[PDB]
Structure 1
Amino acid sequence: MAQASVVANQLIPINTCLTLVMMRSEVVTPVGIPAEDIPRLVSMQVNRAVPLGTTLMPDMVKGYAA
């Protein structure tokens, strides 16, 4: 696998705006939101709590479409 996805660097609470300290990049499987989109994602909100180490998926972010 060599494509990185956005991974939660901390528990991200429900309905909370995404900041850069909340998002790391990691090569994980299954593939989630591409790491190059971390820019785009700042200030978007998640629709569910995202535990530490979870891969951010498109359906978890309100208003995301790639």
Structure 2
Amino acid sequence: ANQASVVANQLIPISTHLTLVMMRSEVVTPVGIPAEDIPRLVSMQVNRAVPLGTTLMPDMVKGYAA
């Protein structure tokens, strides 16, 4: 487990466009969106509410493909 994922740094309400302060990098299980993609995620919209400390998964971000 050395791969870090994107984890919500605050509750992200449904349909919010992500900003940098909302995203942190953490080694969590299961693995979500790779923490290196945090750059690309800015301005993309989440399609559900992501509570504080939840791993951001590919299927929670609208338009995400990588």
Is the TM value for this pair above 0.5? yes
In structure 2, stretches of 5+ residues that fail to align are none
- CA offsets per residue over residues 13-59 of structure 1, 9 Å max, x none? 00010000000000000000000000000000000000000000000
* TM-score (norm. length: structure 2): 0.96
* TM-score (norm. length: structure 1): 0.96
Give % identity.
Answer: 97
Where 1:24 maps in the other structure, the secondary structure is: strand
Compute the RMSD of aligned alpha carbons.
0.2
Structure number with higher strand proportion? 2
Query: Which of structure 1's runs of 4+ aligned residues deviate more than 2 A?
Result: none
How many residues align structurally?
Answer: 64
